[PDB]
Design a protein around this ligand. Structure first.
Ligand SMILES: C[C@@H]1CC[C@@]2(OC1)O[C@H]1C[C@H]3[C@@H]4CC=C5C[C@@H](OCCC(CO[C@@H]6O[C@H](CO)[C@@H](O[C@H]7O[C@H](CO)[C@@H](O)[C@H](O)[C@H]7O)[C@H](O)[C@H]6O)CO[C@@H]6O[C@H](CO)[C@@H](O[C@H]7O[C@H](CO)[C@@H](O)[C@H](O)[C@H]7O)[C@H](O)[C@H]6O)CC[C@]5(C)[C@H]4CC[C@]3(C)[C@H]1[C@@H]2C
Ligand SMILES: C[C@@H]1CC[C@@]2(OC1)O[C@H]1C[C@H]3[C@@H]4CC=C5C[C@@H](OCCC(CO[C@@H]6O[C@H](CO)[C@@H](O[C@H]7O[C@H](CO)[C@@H](O)[C@H](O)[C@H]7O)[C@H](O)[C@H]6O)CO[C@@H]6O[C@H](CO)[C@@H](O[C@H]7O[C@H](CO)[C@@H](O)[C@H](O)[C@H]7O)[C@H](O)[C@H]6O)CC[C@]5(C)[C@H]4CC[C@]3(C)[C@H]1[C@@H]2C
Ligand SMILES: *[C@@H]1O[C@H](CO)[C@@H](O[C@@H]2O[C@H](CO)[C@@H](O)[C@H](O)[C@H]2NC(C)=O)[C@H](O)[C@H]1NC(C)=O
Ligand SMILES: *[C@@H]1O[C@H](CO)[C@@H](O[C@@H]2O[C@H](CO)[C@@H](O)[C@H](O)[C@H]2NC(C)=O)[C@H](O)[C@H]1NC(C)=O
Ligand SMILES: *[C@@H]1O[C@H](CO)[C@@H](O[C@@H]2O[C@H](CO)[C@@H](O)[C@H](O)[C@H]2NC(C)=O)[C@H](O)[C@H]1NC(C)=O
Ligand SMILES: *[C@@H]1O[C@H](CO)[C@@H](O[C@@H]2O[C@H](CO)[C@@H](O)[C@H](O)[C@H]2NC(C)=O)[C@H](O)[C@H]1NC(C)=O
Ligand SMILES: [Cl-]
Ligand SMILES: [Cl-]
Ligand SMILES: [Cl-]
Ligand SMILES: [Cl-]
Ligand SMILES: [K+]
Ligand SMILES: [K+]
Lengths: 537, 537
């Protein structure tokens, strides 16, 4: 074994922690929650994982660190019963993370790369969502079957391109920060068209004006005809909000300044159907027609604190991938606790600094446009990039497609190990393999379980389920590190300096409170199942 | 044993088949789907149960009919493996039926008996639903804990009042038909106020007119001030749909005639947010303000065929309660197949004739008002009653509160039997009992599983889950009656005249297609779990 801390522990953690939510949902989270509550979300979600890494360090500093995987360390150092629970929750988390990574790639493809590559179209006036869901499901079943065939044939090729997907993430992050520094002295041009407080969808009309001049004549624009249903300048069919108010352009990226950061500082939660609005604009109050409602940027889902925590939390998962090469290391009891804790610290500093950067550079109206309707269907992250917005689009697409392949390779190997371990006999039949040792019936079960996550067809609906499984895995790791100290069981002497049982107890309680914060109902279901297995024993 | 067919098999089936959906959701289903598609829903949902009763007759005509319950017949006549599946699916169905019966009683209490007995109020303008859900959950946890204490103490008293809850159902059905016959020559007076096609909520304003006369002076009414935001007769702040249209009263119950039945004959499916409208009225087309949207009757959920099937199907469940007294009967191989099939035929004739009666007597605008907003917060069923609408309100409340108690008494006894039967050792610890033999740890598990159904807090969200469990139970009964004939296993010789294996095969395929019709996603989950247990064996 010859593999150091950097390329053995640190870089796989840093590759498995960054992902889809930094490029699709972080600006939305900043603009919805405010800078202060977004920093609070990042702080709370990075203390479950830091305390869980302190417990995993106490795992790795005990004994020999047996070769192969993070399942075998836990199972040989904690007894089989905690090992089975940690392994099964981590397996279900990895299989739904594959589905979330596929849904992210299809959102990027259908909204930014090729919008004409769309099968189902929003017929009628309203319900653009059912066309969107049925459009996500078809491409989800296509990409999932293609990638399971790739994993069924070409594992050697998936292991080959693993550095390129990390290079794409790092180049696309450095482009964000390079453009954010340039926005201090030279911000880019993305004008946002508004009407009173209300922001509107710029993709539908031509010019952001109420009237124009053609051939020495004042003629109503296309924007007049959507609100007034007549090309005449003196009709009374207009809605009274359009008549009393005026149409105004603003800079979408006003540049890095303290005045922009002061406006983005507090929460602006909306319900489903509300309109994204500024705060410092004059707006005469008036009723508005129901028919002019598609001419605005509308909140897609109802938001709160507990909604945003469950969507953010799978950004911080990825600790457990620092022990998959635990046999290949030179000093596994030293390279694991340093590598995972430094990876959590660096990725958490990237999230804090990016929350402050997006809160200081981008205006909160553009931030709250999930899918970027206020600026001509562009990434809100991509408009801040330095060379072009296409670098972030292409790089985030290839990185999410790589992160899906890595989950579809990592989860059947894990189910293979629990099957051959024979703690649960009900999972006996998934120990079959080929002559290479590659799993067959486990790959089918991961493809069918990740299919049930793809048929939910939303990035915002699958991510609380991921939070729910990774929080159970991290809860049982902290239970099994606190109980073995309080019971004084033999062969449990962790040689880690910064370990204490109260830290693992605090980590257990925090990763249990986040389980209720993310979704209280399914946490209350899992509490019943856990309280029933305890009565079984 | 001295107990005949009528009081032993027929009356418990007829008591357990009628219930909450005949009084709360049948008029809504007729008005939404049309008379023809409502008869098609009743026909399809009564052919799964008739074929399942033909299979249960082949169970009862084999062998001895061992004493006690419907679980012991199936388990001794089909092998333990099918018996465990049928028993566990029927247990989960009974525990969620308790939750649906509690949610029905709380809907009746909070909307018709005591609307001031409401904790959470709809603050703001919109979202009257979250106040409603949080208002259902609190009273659900109160009624569930009270009834589990009653079952924990007073089983002898719950068995005593069992005839009174059947008397309430039969009196409240006879009042419906007595009022429906009276509506031929003397219909009751329930005027419905409308504005163009759109129907409005009469509970908010006083008089159904656009202007009135007070003290020899034409003054705008209260209904003017909601749409125009000014008491002056000559303002231009009115929405243009209110100006171009006129306000009209219609009879809500126009009486039994062929012309009313001809209008109610075809489907009118709406999406969530649409307005209930007539078809034969003049209405000038115009836009409408967003602020006047609470002044209408709005569709609560999006409806289709597959939505209404899953809501209707737990009306027809209740076959399996014809064998709970299988030891007390004089001739159990004769009293069961006659009693259950005659009970299914009589209850299905009641549903067909009531669908035709509500389609012929009540106007389809009043039928599509779930919660009865178009007529002064009254039951749509209750307005057709002969003495008073209060008889149906009180009788349906007491019958649903009795049907919840009967499920909370029947499900822990069933889990007790599967625990003592020892096919699944994981359920070993639920075989404990008191000195009376009454279950203790099973009653706790039924109270915690029915709590997870109450925390969904909708009658329309729990009923597809009930359909999902009773259809799996009825599928395994037909599998176990077809496979034992095709495999020619010993000790399976059913002495029933009208049994054939193709009928049970057709019943299996129909109760599998209804599983996809009711909700395709959770059926696709259960298909995975069933295909995994088969690979285990
Ligand atoms: C050890 C061995 C390994 C394999 C195995 O065991 C043995 O492992 C286990 C693990 C199992 C899996 C465990 C967990 C599971 C998750 C479970 O999902 C629960 C709820 C979610 C799914 O929602 C469903 O999604 C479908 C599809 O949309 C819906 O079906 C609909 O489909 C069509 C649409 O065209 C239509 O007919 C209807 O819409 C409907 O039929 C279901 O109805 C729906 O329940 C998460 O969804 C939740 O939905 C909420 C919406 O109300 C949402 O709330 C918010 O919604 C929006 C946000 O988008 C906002 O407006 C508001 O803020 C809220 O209203 C929630 O966010 C969201 O959580 C499914 C099963 C599965 C995968 C288990 C499968 C078996 C399993 C793998 C076993 C194996 C054997
Ligand atoms: C043998 C031994 C015995 C005991 C045991 O095993 C051992 O038995 C098993 C059996 C287990 C149970 C099996 C099945 C279960 C059902 C499962 O529910 C699945 C989905 C449904 C629940 O929905 C959830 O409801 C909660 C509460 O609302 C939501 O949480 C929300 O709460 C708040 C609201 O304030 C807010 O934060 C968010 O809204 C959210 O957090 C969940 O999100 C939600 O998933 C059914 O709900 C489905 O919801 C759809 C809405 O999207 C709806 O679609 C339609 O919705 C409306 C209609 O109303 C229409 O507009 C459209 O037509 C559609 O959108 C669907 O109709 C609806 O199906 C929960 C677990 C449970 C009970 C298992 C528990 C364990 C169990 C008993 C074991 C034991 C151990
Ligand atoms: C919308 O913007 C226009 C600017 O074109 C505002 O116009 C007012 O115009 C009159 C006469 O042209 C001036 O005397 C006022 O000083 C203007 N008001 C200003 C500059 O605030 C108009 O008031 C705006 N509408 C609003 C703010 O509701
Ligand atoms: C944007 O402008 C509106 C008025 O044009 C602001 O005022 C609110 O308007 C709604 C009407 O839907 C009223 O119900 C509220 O009471 C109004 N709030 C007031 C008067 O304080 C609205 O607040 C503005 N949005 C912002 C500042 O984010
Ligand atoms: C609403 O109802 C009124 C009835 O009061 C209709 O009034 C019309 O009134 C003029 C003059 O009073 C008559 O000459 C017309 O014959 C009436 N039209 C009829 C009876 O159809 C009014 O047209 C109605 N509005 C509609 C149908 O949009
Ligand atoms: C009730 O009246 C409206 C017009 O007052 C009817 O017409 C439809 O109106 C909508 C506007 O929301 C249009 O999009 C449709 O194209 C109209 N349909 C037509 C003209 O056929 C509406 O159909 C009526 N409702 C009924 C008869 O149930
Ligand atoms: Cl991620
Ligand atoms: Cl992880
Ligand atoms: Cl019922
Ligand atoms: Cl039944
Ligand atoms: K991650
Ligand atoms: K029933």
């Amino acid at each position: 074994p010859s593999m150091g801390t950097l390329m053995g522990v640190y870089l796989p953690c840093l590759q498995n922690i960054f992902g889809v939510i930094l490029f699709l949902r972080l600006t939305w989270m900043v603009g919805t929650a405010g800078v202060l509550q977004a920093l609070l979300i990042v702080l709370i979600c990075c203390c479950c994982t830091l305390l869980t890494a302190i417990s995993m360090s106490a795992i790795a500093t005990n004994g020999v660190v047996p070769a192969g995987g993070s399942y075998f360390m836990i199972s040989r150092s904690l007894g089989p019963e905690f090992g089975g629970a940690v392994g099964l929750c981590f397996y279900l988390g990895t299989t739904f993370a594959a589905a979330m990574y596929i849904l992210g790639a299809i959102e990027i493809l259908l909204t930014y790369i090729a919008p004409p590559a769309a099968i189902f179209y929003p017929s009628g006036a309203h319900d653009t969502s059912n066309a969107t869901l049925n459009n996500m499901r078809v491409y989800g079943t296509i990409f999932l079957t293609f990638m399971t065939l790739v994993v069924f044939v070409g594992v050697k090729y998936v292991n080959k391109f693993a550095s390129l997907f990390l290079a794409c993430v790092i180049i696309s992050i450095l482009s964000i920060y390079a453009g954010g520094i340039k926005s201090i002295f030279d911000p880019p041009v993305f004008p946002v068209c508004m009407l009173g407080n209300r922001t509107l969808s710029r993709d539908q009309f031509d010019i952001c004006a109420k009237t124009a001049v053609v051939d020495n004549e004042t003629v109503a624009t296309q924007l007049w005809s959507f609100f007034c249903h007549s090309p005449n300048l003196t009709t009374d069919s207009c809605d009274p909000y359009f008549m009393l108010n005026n149409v105004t352009e603003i800079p979408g990226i006003p540049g890095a300044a303290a005045g922009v950061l002061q406006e983005n500082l507090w929460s602006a939660y909306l319900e489903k159907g509300d309109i994204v609005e500024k705060h410092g604009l004059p707006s005469a109050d008036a009723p508005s027609l129901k028919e002019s409602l598609p001419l605005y940027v509308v909140a897609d889902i109802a938001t709160s604190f507990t909604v945003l925590v469950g969507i953010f939390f799978p950004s911080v998962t990825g600790i457990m991938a620092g022990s998959n090469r635990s046999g290949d290391l030179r000093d596994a009891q030293k390279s694991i606790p340093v590598g995972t804790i430094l990876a959590i610290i660096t990725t958490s500093l990237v999230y804090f600094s990016s929350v402050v950067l997006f809160g200081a550079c981008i205006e909160g109206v553009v931030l709250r446009d999930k899918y970027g309707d206020g600026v001509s269907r562009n990434l809100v992250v991509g408009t801040l990039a330095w060379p072009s917005p296409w670098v972030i689009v292409i790089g985030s697409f290839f990185s999410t497609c790589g992160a899906g392949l890595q989950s579809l390779t990592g989860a059947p190997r894990l189910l293979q190990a629990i099957a051959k371990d024979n703690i649960i006999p009900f999972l006996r039949v998934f120990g079959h393999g080929k002559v290479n040792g590659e799993p067959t019936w486990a790959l089918l079960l991961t493809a069918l379980i990740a299919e049930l996550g793809i048929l939910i067809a939303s990035l915002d609906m699958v991510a609380p389920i991921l939070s729910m499984f990774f929080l159970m895995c991290y809860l049982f790791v902290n239970l099994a590190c606190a109980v073995q100290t309080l019971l004084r069981t033999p062969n449990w002497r962790p040689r880690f300096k910064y370990y204490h049982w109260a830290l693992s107890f605090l980590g257990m309680s925090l990763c249990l409170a986040l389980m209720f914060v993310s979704s209280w109902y399914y946490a209350l279901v899992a509490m019943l199942i856990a309280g029933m297995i305890y009565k079984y024993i």
